């Protein structure tokens, strides 16, 4: 298991901040939509888990709001990377929320990680892939703990 270092966190926070649209939801929705399209392509069964947010129509307001929630959740976690005591509470919170969704499993987080790794180089300038991979693991593993 490769550690998400101080340097990695700086790289990830930089890439994430530089690509962020701070006042409008459109960009974060586009990012998440691409992530979910990749996730569902890789794991067709995973889409069923999202029936409660209209995943069948990814352009729907229902699904777009889910996209906002997921990207916000990741944004909050990324911004906590330099305060890991706080990060741990946040990841435990997200973990509880995912434990409450029947069928969500640790394996899905590996596929989600593949999806972000595919999408982030398409939205982020000078994207640091190794730092992203290590720090996404730090975050994802905290959420998937207990499932």
């Amino acid at each position: 298991s490769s550690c998400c270092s101080s340097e990695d966190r700086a790289n990830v926070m930089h890439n994430w901040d530089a690509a962020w649209s701070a006042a409008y939801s459109d960009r974060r929705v586009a990012l998440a939509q691409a992530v979910f399209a990749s996730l569902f392509s890789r794991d067709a069964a995973a889409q069923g888990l999202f029936s409660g947010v209209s995943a069948d129509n990814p352009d729907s307001a229902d699904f777009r709001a889910h996209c906002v929630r997921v990207v916000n959740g990741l944004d909050v976690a990324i911004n906590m990377l330099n305060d890991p005591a706080v990060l741990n509470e946040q990841l435990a919170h997200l973990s509880a929320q995912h434990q409450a969704r029947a069928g969500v499993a640790a394996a899905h987080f590996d596929v989600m990680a593949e999806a972000f790794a595919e999408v982030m180089p398409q939205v982020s300038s000078c994207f640091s892939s190794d730092s992203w991979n290590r720090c996404f693991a730090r975050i994802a593993n905290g959420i998937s703990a207990g499932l």
Binding site: S21, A22, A23, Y24, D26
Partner: protein
């Protein structure tokens, strides 16, 4: 003078504050539609004379709004180089002379709508500098109209 170098710098700074890194590229349509709403109320000009009939739900009007805010942006950002600004305004003047029903008074109303909407989204706006510099812009666009 009227719209001095200092006045121009304030106006450019304030327009840049409205269209800052967060807002630039996403807010032009909303700003522009608001400018047109104020302009229609103050000028009495028919929305029907505009592409898409002034309907904000029409892509033809939305593209017109994009063009107008961009023309304003170009003129504003050139306020400190008067010879260049004069040329930009002369080009815009020629474009409007080729359009029936554009009056000097209406050009003034649109320029004042730009100022008034800026002051609504940026309450600290230097309303005097905006008045002087938008009057210079209106004089150029509305020349002979």
């Amino acid at each position: 003078e009227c719209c001095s170098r200092g006045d121009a710098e304030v106006v450019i700074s304030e327009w840049d504050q409205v269209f800052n890194a967060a807002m630039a590229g996403s807010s032009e349509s909303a700003i522009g539609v608001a400018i047109f709403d104020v302009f229609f109320t103050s000028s009495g000009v028919s929305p029907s004379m505009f592409p898409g009939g002034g309907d904000s739900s029409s892509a033809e009007f939305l593209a017109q709004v994009s063009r107008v805010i961009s023309g304003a942006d170009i003129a504003i950002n050139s306020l400190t180089n008067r010879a260049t600004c004069d040329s930009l305004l002369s080009h815009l003047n020629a474009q409007h002379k080729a359009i029936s029903g554009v009056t000097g008074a209406a050009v003034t109303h649109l320029s004042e709508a730009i100022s008034s909407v800026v002051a609504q989204v940026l309450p600290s706006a230097h309303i005097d500098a905006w008045g002087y510099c938008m009057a210079y812009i209106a004089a150029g666009i509305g020349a002979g109209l």
